[PDB]
Design a protein around this nucleic acid. Structure first.
Ligand SMILES: Nc1ncnc2c1ncn2[C@@H]1O[C@H](COP(=O)(O)OP(=O)(O)OP(O)(O)=S)[C@@H](O)[C@H]1O
Ligand SMILES: Nc1ncnc2c1ncn2[C@@H]1O[C@H](COP(=O)(O)OP(=O)(O)OP(O)(O)=S)[C@@H](O)[C@H]1O
Ligand SMILES: [Mg+2]
Ligand SMILES: [Mg+2]
Lengths: 78, 333, 333
DNA sequence: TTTTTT
């Protein structure tokens, strides 16, 4: 599985939270998806987008929920 | 032993609260007739079926939202006409400033008895709504396009000035002030809302509704109405196929959906609803593309059968009576 | 010598405080029975496990908040029904004016015995709650949507008037006046709150709750309830898959979560909870989609196993007993 | 403390 998370440069993360967010999402996928190599790449781009390669619609919904929980637990993990 | 003085203290507290705040301040739920849910027909039989309780609950707040030209003002004008036919007073707080009074009579609305207000500001709109609710003489109020509920500060300001959540603050305050007034006066309030797409949709659907979050919590019934086709008689489009998905319901089971036809200049095709409702109910026989009733072959195609039902009123009354008998889960009378 | 004088002074001071303020003004914590935590079942076994102490602590303030139609009202009504099944007396302060007595009856609530109040003002709401708590004859009071706890000045004012933190000030005053009364009467107060958006925050959760900050401080148990999916019987959606997050806990370990179903018209699916918790405790065997209990194949799918449990009351009580023995962190006396 | 907006 390949996960790409692009974050709008007009709505940036706090300084240093990009790498922390990437690692934290990596922890979340390896917990949720241990059988496959979950590589997340978080980066600044023009628009905030999430791309899932190698998964079905239900899996994509699961990853979206995981990213939601990560973004809303930022204070817990950062 | 302890239960008796417990009951004594309970009765004393109930009496003291009654004295402090009024006769109906506190009482057992079983003996509170004011909490019974009363509904009125929406002008669409399929929508009354989908709503579970047989219509929109009186004394509650209803949010109805859909895309451009989805028929929301037509559905609300239809329920206004249905309420007026029963003998109720109605008001239309038309914020978006496009109510055609001539099309309103066409949809059956008594224009002479419909209180019309074109509010300048959102605060003025909601204050007029609060005054109408507190009066108690208005049974149905419809606020068109809460997007047009422009705050006074936003109006006095310039286009391009950022007003942080001010409309949401106003909407929440209006809900706070209005829920109790509407409950006390037993007045139904229907908020027509728009869909706004959000930017960066990673955790949810783009279709947001303007006016903040308070309307979602406070609305007893939330309707998602959309146009799903065209009713073309020949090459002329003479109507629209619409679907309403009850996304929030506090008076019956939600997530039901109702499909019907708005026919431009006539409104909701009620006999068109009746044909399909009888068809799914086995009382109207669908033989491929043929429609037959009790062996009597009434027509071919949906439009011809609807016309035939228009031609035969007594059978329409009978089929309506039966459909209401079985399909309505909570028949009031 | 010195230690004897210290003991003499301590005993004299304790006696003086007891004559001045009463018998139970001060004592050693270990010998204070009024300080023990008593819990009441939520109506949801999984949430009871997630709460650590087996339920909601009696005599405390509890906040339950979440988005629209997430099941806040239904969860609180199940709590009320569970309390009433133990002979306790419950009260419902409906600030939303959005309670359906028939649906409350269908959830198992003794409607004829549930005290219900539709207060006009938030001050009236909290004063009725204060009177009921001070009475000592009401065990569980549920205040619906402190977002609708509207200050009296706000009602008297106009829509668009600025009442800067008036609700927050009133909530802070009410907590100060209410915590002691709730502790004294050993009555549990459950607050439902709505989720609002805080703006200007680009990271973290923008989900603030209404009623200010005093509720966050004074609440012993804070629950984030969210509808995370649909329960459908093929086509018709019959309920909601919901998750409750214990975001604050003063009686047990926080940050635990529970997952269950609210079936429309039945409330929390206790049997589905039992099936799931038996699965977690290695008591119900899952071979793919095949649920089997002790060799016997009870059912295929969650619905079939739940029906099998419904049709075998003895087995259901047996698994309830062993699950309660196993997974409850703090086994009550 | 109080509230999203496309
Ligand atoms: N005066 C009229 N005469 C005939 N047809 C009309 C008239 N007004 C509207 N319609 C049509 O009726 C259908 C739905 O009615 P509307 O009341 O316009 O719905 P709506 O979703 O409220 O549209 P809005 O408010 O402009 S976004 C649309 O297809 C309209 O074109
Ligand atoms: N009278 C009713 N009949 C059928 N279903 C209902 C009824 N009331 C609530 N429900 C459903 O039960 C689920 C939980 O509803 P509630 O517990 O009333 O929602 P809530 O979390 O209190 O959020 P609110 O108060 O509506 S903003 C929802 O999916 C409701 O649609
Ligand atoms: Mg319109
Ligand atoms: Mg509710």
């Amino acid at each position: 599985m390949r996960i790409e998370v692009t974050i709008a440069k007009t709505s940036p993360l706090p300084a240093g939270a990009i790498d922390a967010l990437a690692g934290e999402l990596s922890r979340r996928i390896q917990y949720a998806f241990p059988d496959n190599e979950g590589h997340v790449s978080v980066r600044y781009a023009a628009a905030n987008n999430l791309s899932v390669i190698g998964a079905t619609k239900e899996d994509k919904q699961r990853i979206s929920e995981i990213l939601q929980e990560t973004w809303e637990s930022a204070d817990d993990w950062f | 032993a302890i239960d008796e003085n417990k009951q004594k203290a309970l009765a004393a507290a109930l009496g003291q609260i009654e004295k402090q705040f009024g006769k109906g301040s506190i009482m057992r739920l079983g003996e509170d007739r004011s909490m019974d849910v009363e509904t009125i027909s929406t002008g669409s039989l399929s929508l009354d079926i989908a709503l579970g309780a047989g219509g929109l609950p009186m004394g509650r707040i209803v949010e109805i939202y859909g895309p451009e030209s989805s028929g929301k003002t037509t559905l609300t004008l239809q329920v206004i006409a249905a309420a007026q036919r029963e003998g109720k007073t109605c008001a239309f707080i038309d914020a978006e400033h496009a109510l055609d009074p001539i099309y309103a009579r066409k949809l059956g609305v008594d224009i002479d008895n419909l209180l019309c207000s074109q509010p300048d500001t959102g605060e003025q709109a909601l204050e007029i709504c609060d005054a109408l609710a507190r009066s108690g003489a208005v049974d149905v109020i419809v606020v068109d396009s809460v997007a047009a509920l422009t705050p006074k500060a936003e109006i006095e300001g310039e286009i391009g000035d950022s007003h942080m959540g001010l409309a949401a603050r106003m909407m929440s305050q209006a809900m706070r002030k209005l829920a109790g007034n509407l409950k006390q006066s037993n007045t139904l309030l229907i908020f027509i809302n728009q869909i706004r797409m959000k930017i960066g949709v990673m955790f949810g659907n783009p279709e947001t509704t303007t006016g903040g979050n308070a309307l979602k919590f406070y609305a007893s019934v939330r309707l998602d109405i959309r146009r799903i086709g065209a009713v073309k008689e020949g090459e002329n489009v003479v109507g629209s196929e619409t679907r309403v998905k009850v996304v929030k319901n506090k008076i019956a089971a939600p997530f039901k959906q109702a499909e019907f036809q708005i026919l431009y200049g006539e409104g909701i095709n009620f006999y068109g609803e009746l044909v399909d409702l009888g068809v799914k109910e086995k009382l109207i026989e669908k033989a491929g593309a043929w429609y037959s009733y009790k062996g009597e072959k009434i027509g071919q195609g949906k439009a011809n059968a609807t016309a035939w039902l228009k031609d035969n009123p007594e059978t329409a009354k009978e089929i309506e009576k039966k459909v209401r008998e079985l399909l309505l889960s909570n028949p009031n009378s």
